[PDB]
Amino acid sequence: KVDEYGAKDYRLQMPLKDDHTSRPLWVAPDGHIFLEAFSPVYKYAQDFLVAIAEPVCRPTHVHEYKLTAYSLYAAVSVGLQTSDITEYLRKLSKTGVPDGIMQFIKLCTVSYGKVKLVLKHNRYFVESCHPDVIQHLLQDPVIRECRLRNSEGEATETVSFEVKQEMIEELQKRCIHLEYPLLAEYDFRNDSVNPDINIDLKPTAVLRPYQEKSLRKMFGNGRARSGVIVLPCGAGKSLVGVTAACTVRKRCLVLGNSAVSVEQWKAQFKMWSTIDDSQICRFTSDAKDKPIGCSVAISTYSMLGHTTKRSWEAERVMEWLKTQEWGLMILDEVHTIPAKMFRRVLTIVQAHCKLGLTATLVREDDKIVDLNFLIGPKLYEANWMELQNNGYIAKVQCAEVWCPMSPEFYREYVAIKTKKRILLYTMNPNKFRACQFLIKFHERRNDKIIVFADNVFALKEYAIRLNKPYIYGPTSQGERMQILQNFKHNPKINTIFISKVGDTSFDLPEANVLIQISSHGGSRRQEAQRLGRVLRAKKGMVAEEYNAFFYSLVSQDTQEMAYSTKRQRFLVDQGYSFKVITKLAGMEEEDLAFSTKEEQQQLLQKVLAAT
């Protein structure tokens, strides 16, 4: 039922009880949950909702969470039954819990972990304690095709049965349709095929409370369970993965986005694990190492996604990997997994425990529902504002700066209607002046300035006119690291211009001032992840609530505005605010480029030359 104002009239189905201020939760029958942070029971409710519900919005005071079948499965596999969840909900709900939500929870929890998938002898078996379920499922044609066929094409016979390797993800999706999701549980201590490894945790390793909480939630009753953990960049997420690998101590395979990711993973493993370097190898095309005796093998998706013929040695290493069965597999940048080629990698590799870590989980192509069974339920997601309060990461000062359009530029922008409009507003003379003023001001403040520009041409022109280092498609790796070290060590040069490769193609040194000029055009997760990775925790200004500075230049009256509001929405979900700065104080006195419009019309000439 809907009110004339459009709001949902849930009052009738919600019996309100007098314990209003004491209880902090609202449970609408839509499945959504609302929590008040100012309530004294905030911490307990916070942990309960995190355990049971997937967070949606966490602004300063009131937070919204959501209930999903995957969230309920995660809660059940943690070890919580229906009665306890219902009791705790009713103890925290301001109003009575609607019977519809109760029934939904009952239906979800009554069948969770019913079906078990076992990887033994390089063979995948489906087994359970309810043979009627399995027998009834045999009628499903997709299950019939997924089931392993004999040499004669016949079907292979708590008795389990082998399933075709290629048809795992098909079974993964199908089981959801069968309302009987599989269980990704590993024999952490009962393992006998794969022995342990001489790898432990160095005493220098420190588990921050949220990291330890996430790890222990993953280790449900001491058994590792597949899932995804979301942590901000530089919050020890790599350290968290290293710690998990050390805990498992079984054969470990790690996949990174690029070669720099592999190098960082190897360095982190050396920095905190006791594994000897003889057992660490990088399955890359540049640094080749023998796979034999390699306890922890680090590679990239492309090195496993090569449909084309590889090098002969690469073929041998792939054969070794396929033969070997992995107790643990680690995937970084999970948001890139839903791509078809990378999804095929999961079928290619046979591993028991797969764990995914990333900074964001909102793929703009909404290919995330499948990921809930590609890997598993979202294990954890730390509150960004809470981590800011604890000082684990910098307390960022976000800002969106609007730049007026030159009349000639705006007339041209309106004249064009196709995708070619990108160049004009990305080359706004006023935007150039604003960026120059910001760079001058922060250099006078002695700040680490990193300027992003997704457009290749705009990046080149901006960096060259400002005479600052620029990195783009070519990105000669040796010279790339040379520029990075110049920024890190030389105080004379502290202004680095980086193209789209700054997302995941290399390592970003910790900075304090991040100026984003051009973006993908709606990649709400990509540039938010770029902001998270660029700005890290810095000593000295921890007490202040604004120790990291982020500026997003947007051209007024352009379509770019529509992108920015579309994009930073994700950061709004984390409580981050963006104050509009139409005009910058101090630009008048300081001399900047394009003071004359005669220069600006020459710039327009240059831009229009490239159509």
């Binding site: 307990y44 942990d47 309960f48 306890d84 588990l207 330890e212 909480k213 222990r216 280790f219």
Partner: peptide, 15 residues
């Protein structure tokens, strides 16, 4: 070895 098992259920108690 703190990862053997841990729950904040007892933290959630009426007061």
């Amino acid at each position: 070895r703190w990862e053997g098992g841990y729950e904040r259920t007892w933290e959630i108690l009426k007061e």
